[PDB]
Structure formats: structure tokens, C-alpha cells
Amino acid sequence: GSSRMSTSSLRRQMKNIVHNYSEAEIKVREATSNDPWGPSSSLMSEIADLTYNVVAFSEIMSMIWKRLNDHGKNWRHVYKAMTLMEYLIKTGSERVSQQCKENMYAVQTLKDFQYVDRDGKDQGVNVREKAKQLVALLRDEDRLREER
């Protein structure tokens, strides 16, 4: 320069901050399964703050529906998917609850999702009642249905 001498050589830097906040797909996943380690502050609260948006929201409930219908061997992903679908439906946003009513068959498909391998133990109940709960709160009483 003039009086000082640059010391930090440095080479090149990456891009900049993405103006399109789109990191929900990662939160939802790490939220329905924390096998590994990482930050432990409030991942669920993050996926909800994303529902408010318009993109991240669809990427959130979407990944939540897939892990919600896992196979009949490890419902662990399903139970975790119910916590993210129930948390977002509340603080997440008003759009996360509307989708739950439009996809009630998906949240109810878990109440019947029962499997214990050819011969194992019946431990897939925690998830059975879980899915039933998400639908109970989102709809406690009904005003006479009407399906032909």
C-alpha cells in the first residue's frame, strides 16, 4: 500500500449470501432424525419460520410426507416427521395447517400403519397415536361431514 504492507496473502472467496433463503429442506430432514450430532438450539423453530415463506414451506411439509410413510421396519422417521408436521402447523404458519386439512388422509394413514416384521414386538404404537393426535388438534369437532 503506502505506509503499511499487506500480509494476509489470501487467494479467492466463494459467492455471497443467497437472497433466496432456501435451507428448509435441510432443517426438516435433520429435524425428523438427529442420529448424527450438530447444533442443538431449535431446529423445529427454524422449519416453522420457513413455512411463512412460500418455497421453503412446500419443501418442508413435502419432505415431511415422504419420511412420514416410511417402510414397515423403521417408523422412527415417521414419529419424528409427526413432530415437525405438528410444530409447523402451529407456529410454522397458517399455510402448514391448511395443507394438513387437504392431506388428512396422509396424517391418518399412520394411525393404521402397523408393522412388526414376520415376527417381532408391537412397538409401533407411539407413532400410531402420534399421527392421530396431529389430526385431532387440527380438527377436534366436525359439523356433520358429507362424503358420498
Determine if residue 77 is labeled as part of a ligand binding site: yes
The x, y and z cell numbers of residue 71, run together, are 417402510
**Spatial contact of 98 and 146, defined as CB atoms under 8 Å apart:** no
* Four-CA torsion 44, 47, 49, 50, nearest 10 degrees: 180
d(CA 98, CA 81): 17
Determine if residue 69 is labeled as part of a ligand binding site: no
User: Looking at residue 67, what DSSP letter applies?
Assistant: G
Determine if residue 67 is labeled as part of a ligand binding site: yes
Determine if residue 66 is labeled as part of a ligand binding site: no
**Spatial contact of 88 and 96, defined as CB atoms under 8 Å apart:** yes
Binding-site residues, in ranges, read: 12, 15, 29, 34, 67, 77
